[PDB]
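Exercise 7. Predict the joint structure of the components listed below.
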Amino acid sequence: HVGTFENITAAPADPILGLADLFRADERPGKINLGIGLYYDETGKIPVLTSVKKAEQYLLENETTKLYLGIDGIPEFGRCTQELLFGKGSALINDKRARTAQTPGGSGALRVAADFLAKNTSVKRVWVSNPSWPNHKSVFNSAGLEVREYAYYDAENHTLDFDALINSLNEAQAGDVVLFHGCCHNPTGIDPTLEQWQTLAQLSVEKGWLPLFDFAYQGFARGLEEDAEGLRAFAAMHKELIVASSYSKNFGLYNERVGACTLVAADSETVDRAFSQMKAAIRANYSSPPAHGASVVATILSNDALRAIWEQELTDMRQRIQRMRQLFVNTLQEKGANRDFSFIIKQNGMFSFSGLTKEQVLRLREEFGVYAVASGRVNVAGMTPDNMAPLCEAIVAVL
Amino acid sequence: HVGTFENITAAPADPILGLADLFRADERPGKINLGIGLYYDETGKIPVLTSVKKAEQYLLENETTKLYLGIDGIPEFGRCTQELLFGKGSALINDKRARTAQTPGGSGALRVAADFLAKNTSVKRVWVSNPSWPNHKSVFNSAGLEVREYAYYDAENHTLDFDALINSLNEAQAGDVVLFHGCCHNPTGIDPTLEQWQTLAQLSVEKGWLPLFDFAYQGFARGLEEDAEGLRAFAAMHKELIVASSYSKNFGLYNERVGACTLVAADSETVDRAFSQMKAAIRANYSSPPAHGASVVATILSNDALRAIWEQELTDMRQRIQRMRQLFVNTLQEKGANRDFSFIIKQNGMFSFSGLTKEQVLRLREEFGVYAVASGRVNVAGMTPDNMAPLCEAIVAVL
Ligand SMILES: *Cc1c(COP(=O)(O)O)cnc(C)c1O
Ligand SMILES: *Cc1c(COP(=O)(O)O)cnc(C)c1O
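Solution:
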């Protein structure tokens, strides 16, 4: 008999995660990793937050069992998540229109939404921005959903091309899903203004779209409440929406896989009925979510003292990235760049579409040991006072 | 616009997890949970193992980062998994014919295998024993695979109907997947003898089946090495096979979601090519696996002193279940059963088919607060010296 695995075509490496393998293999001294979206501190390390360590100590001392969580996870984690997304006193919460499942990261939240939609609704099509996080297409395709792209980025002016965004969504139909990044658009770092969010909210209502928010960076643009303004403008107007959120980056809990999928419907009876099918889709995947990471988050958010520590740690991360954005622009000029990079200061979050070509990104890797994503996305949070001058000399050399 | 969620029909309750919800809400103080497959100690608690607490203390004081694991998880966890499954010095390992991905539980390993098969091969059907774990059908169906049943249990004699098993499987074609439980068949507790395993292995290569082992109870039948004899008899003869294993039960790590999916192919080139698509299917699901539970397992297995403690804790669990099986049989006779229950002694693991009808199981819940699965599966590890008498009085009262 012929093997089952003989006709298999190899898959290419992931455009983001395969960078770690390449970077690890590189033996050139002084190599610089600007690839995967991790926060690095001023010394080039990826630390555990103090608030996380304190919560983990409390769990070690007080956990008496590891028995399975329910399919939807820790109840307190869901409640705190809804307050973070929608605000204390939100009508969505008071009216019991929202249900939340704890999931394995924002990635798992996106997949649970995809499986739920494909199996229980007539949704056939998901619209994502061009560019977006490369894994968006893969997640929705895995459930057999068609993914279409809408225009987003003005690569000439380095701004949101709002006119092209509106025009390119003209053919998104009632019952299609439209995916929005809540803040810190990945990869461009360009977000709608409040007025633009409000314009999109009124348009989505009039066209009948089902909005899906990917919210992986709450707190990295301006602050926790401010970064949720766009989502909340949508929530004030819509009967239905889905939020896939992540605590990987804003708690530094990447490898513990802490996220949430929140379903919002017109009333409590409808969302409970829908949520029962979301739980069934979880049961047929990983059954129930991992406790440790979500327990840490729930502990921090429900303790005033730990929460205050965490909020300051998040402010410190946000502020260090902003300083690095400015230092990057200044050092590029110092090192002789004639191209104007001041648009980088206007972008939010960990990244920035640098405008480098694929050929320039490959050259940076091969000749200089500097690792960026082939799209030109560079992780500003990977820049430090110590590596800034060599990485700017490298960029200037490939321009 | 009519809502996308308006017409969703509610999902039925999970036959196992829905019963756990009912049990939790039940206000009667004498209620007894013989449903979901958790290990209870002699005092009716579900404890954290001492080896696990020690490993967690080491992690708390030595972890410096939560940066993402690779798609396939902790390398040492994969190596230790392969050794446990195939034994040190296995040709499969020395020939580099196996690749392992760390997954969120055995459940996650099953879905990853299913997605991988559905999207990258010509496999269309999966053969499952009648009866089996209720969630097998859901996992495989949700990946798009047809599920077929083969005969297994003789309910009159409470034995393995080996002739019926072989006869029913002659309808399975080359290229079909056949699912075997490695040991401690769920729900019957009836496993093949080594001779029967070897007969099935020979038939499997002759017929061209792709074997998939669900290995959730290694160590609970006879021992770690002994419980893998059946799997190793297949591994000696087959070019290809898949193992989905779980550390939920044999480490008491249920809610941290620790399992593995292991691929075996004819040679190193083929398994690496197939594993590249397995990683792509993981990336489009939860991206990368949760670190805490797998780190605990890897720490225990890679440290001689911790491993010795763990092996003794697992032996104690296995022997406690064996004592409860004997006590259950003896106590039924004293309480007046007048019916042979001696077949309970011959069954392995947590579960036995009690032979009770669904009406009897329903009476036990409603009138006596004793919770079993509607199939009559009872969790012997939920029995204790303190709840044995009331349990058995309740059973005698419904016979
Ligand atoms: C990081 C990220 C995710 C995935 O988050 P995880 O919690 O790591 O799974 C999803 N969407 C975007 C836009 C991200 O940046
Ligand atoms: C427990 C069990 C599983 C699931 O394992 P998890 O690690 O809890 O996801 C799968 N198959 C069988 C037969 C089981 O008993």
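Discussion. The two ends of chain A are 56 Å apart (CA to CA).
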